[PDB]
Amino acid sequence: IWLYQFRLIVIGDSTVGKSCLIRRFTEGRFAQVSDPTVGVDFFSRLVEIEPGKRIKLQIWDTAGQERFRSITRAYYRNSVGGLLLFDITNRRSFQNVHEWLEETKVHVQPYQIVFVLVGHKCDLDTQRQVTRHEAEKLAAAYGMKYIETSARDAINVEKAFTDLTRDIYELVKRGEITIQEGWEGVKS
Ligand SMILES: Nc1nc2c(ncn2[C@@H]2O[C@H](COP(=O)(O)OP(=O)(O)NP(=O)(O)O)[C@@H](O)[C@H]2O)c(=O)[nH]1
Ligand SMILES: [Mg+2]
């Protein structure tokens, strides 16, 4: 059925589109109306990364609101990978990416989380407040890749999760990430 199970965490400011991204990926639908997340919700999906090779993704949908941050950060340890969103139409959400990144950098046990930077709501092209280039430069400065997604228009949603799963899978194949006693980030 699957080779590995990976735990992924999706993080970023409130309202950037984390829950909608995850629901488009797992439910294939766009939630036109979306309550702010309280604590951390759970979604799952199998992905076939290569023919006959499946990875189970256990996805933690985190609350962006500041008052739930104590809950969100409790999940960093047991995550192997994640997506860090900003909203391309919300420059303050981009300004906060460095803060989200600096905070994950002190959560490097058993490993640094494998992150991709996600410029979300890329359907709102005329409302853009962040250039692709400055987001690509920020991602590169933290050694991560960048992708622009839309939950509304189903743009790059499968690719965001699938590319990150392939990256983690290759790190596991090289032994750079391994199963660890009591860690839930990777399971055989
Ligand atoms: N145009 C557009 N709107 C989107 C997109 N994704 C989410 N939205 C909208 O953005 C708002 C917040 O989305 P939501 O996923 O709830 O955000 P969040 O990051 O989960 N918020 P929180 O951290 O508080 O739980 C909603 O109005 C939702 O419809 C997208 O790709 N495009
Ligand atoms: Mg949410």
Helix content: 25-40%
Separation of termini?
A: 11 Å
Count of separate DSSP helical elements: 6
The CATH top-level class label: Alpha Beta
Total number of distinct structural domains? 1
Radius of gyration equals 15 Å
Helix/sheet category: alpha/beta
- Principal-axis shape equals globular
Largest sheet, strands/sense/barrel = 7 strands, mixed
The portion of residues forming beta strands comes to: 25-35%
The CATH H-level superfamily is P-loop containing nucleotide triphosphate hydrolases
> What's the CATH architecture?
3-Layer(aba) Sandwich
Which ligands accompany this protein?
phosphoaminophosphonic acid-guanylate ester, magnesium ion
What CATH calls the topology is: Rossmann fold
How are helices and strands ordered from N to C? Answer: EHEEHEHHEHEHE
PDB class: structural genomics
Keywords: Ras-related protein Rab-39B, Structural Genomics
Assembly: monomeric
Entry title: Structure of the human RAB39B in complex with GMPPNP
Please characterize this protein's 3D structure.
- With 188 residues, this protein is α/β, with parallel strands linked by helices.
- The protein is 29% helix and 27% strand.
- It is built from 6 helices and 7 strands.
- Strands 1, 2, 3, 4, 5, 6 and 7 form a 7-stranded mixed sheet that branches.
- The structure holds phosphoaminophosphonic acid-guanylate ester and magnesium ion (MG).
- The site of phosphoaminophosphonic acid-guanylate ester has 21 residues, from helix 1.
- InterPro entries: P-loop_NTPase, Rab39, Rab_GTPases_membrane_traffic, Small_GTP-bd, Small_GTPase.
- It catalyses: GTP + H2O = GDP + phosphate + H(+).
